[PDB]
Design a protein around this nucleic acid. Structure first.
Ligand SMILES: [Mg+2]
Ligand SMILES: [Mg+2]
Lengths: 163, 163
DNA sequence: CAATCGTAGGAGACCTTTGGTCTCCCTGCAGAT
DNA sequence: ATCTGCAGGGTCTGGTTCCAGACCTACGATTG
């Protein structure tokens, strides 16, 4: 009963749920790159692969990863980056033996009753902390919303339910 | 000794050069998927990882990969795709033990004197044929220009010269 | 450090060489033989 | 099948045969 959840973008995270009910969540590793004479943050491929290889989740574990679907009004750099982060994550997960299942944000948001929220990121952190109370301290900052999304993706895949 | 060259886009290829002078080139694996009610070609992650795992090139072999640099006039779908394809290949190569070195198309084109051609893809196929004459039969078609570019990237990395 | 705001954006190599100049794809989808 | 031409484009799910309604992200910058 292992489940993995991945928020693949630059502030994202990977969550790992164990059969005994324990959970781990890891911020996505990144590095600072020079592009067009400015600095950009980019996912750290080797650290991701090393992170996956050190997981105790066995081969065949399912990884639920949020589907890339940027808005037509997002810029072309946004489109490249969501595509790049998605491809790098999917290849790393497959190479590490995990079975990848893409999930639309509409799917897990509806599942946990989070659609049409005035504060979607805050509500995600609140839902994740309720499902994983031992992660409550790791979810108190606004910048922890990627941790929450990864946990909620894993909770969705595991079929967990809010009280 | 061993050198890998990767043209990462959907009609691209991976070339593998051996220390004895032999060469192999494989079209990039792809599948057809439904996106927004139409059919799209997307690289086949699992097939790419299995291909890489089957190479005799040892760990630490350098994989020269063409840097993604879409034009600001290309559509946002082109930007997403080139990012996705790039990320997928980089992670697959890293996970399979290879050292990844991104090369700009202007670098290997200038090295082989191909800059400012009015028929750049035809010229690439001609140059690859001369450098790898046993691949002449595999470079006869217009759609083989991806195979040509992968071979030229690998030949660049190995320091080959046209006669 | 952590949060907020507002728009949606190229990038690279090598020279002219501490800024300038010139170069380079790709995707998606319809058509034609 | 292979190639040519040419413009640069959302995509998804829950509900059916198209509709209705839903969803981000990146990149720079400034505020304490
Ligand atoms: Mg997300
Ligand atoms: Mg290319």
């Amino acid at each position: 009963g292992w489940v993995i959840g991945v928020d693949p973008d630059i502030g994202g995270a990977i969550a790992v749920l164990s059969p005994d009910g324990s959970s781990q969540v890891f911020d996505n590793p990144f590095v600072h790159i020079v592009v067009s004479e400015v600095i950009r943050k980019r996912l750290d491929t080797k650290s991701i692969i090393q992170l996956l290889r050190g997981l105790d989740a066995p081969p065949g574990t399912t990884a639920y990863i949020e589907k890339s679907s940027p808005f037509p009004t997002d810029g072309k750099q946004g489109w490249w980056s969501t595509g790049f982060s998605y491809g790098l994550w999917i290849a790393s997960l497959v190479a590490s033996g995990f079975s990848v299942v893409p999930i639309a944000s509409q799917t897990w948001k509806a599942y946990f009753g989070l659609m049409r929220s005035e504060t979607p990121k805050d509500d995600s952190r609140q839902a994740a902390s309720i499902l994983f109370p031992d992660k409550d301290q790791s979810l108190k900052l606004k910048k922890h919303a990627g941790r929450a999304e990864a946990l909620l993706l894993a909770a969705y895949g595991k079929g967990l339910v809010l009280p």
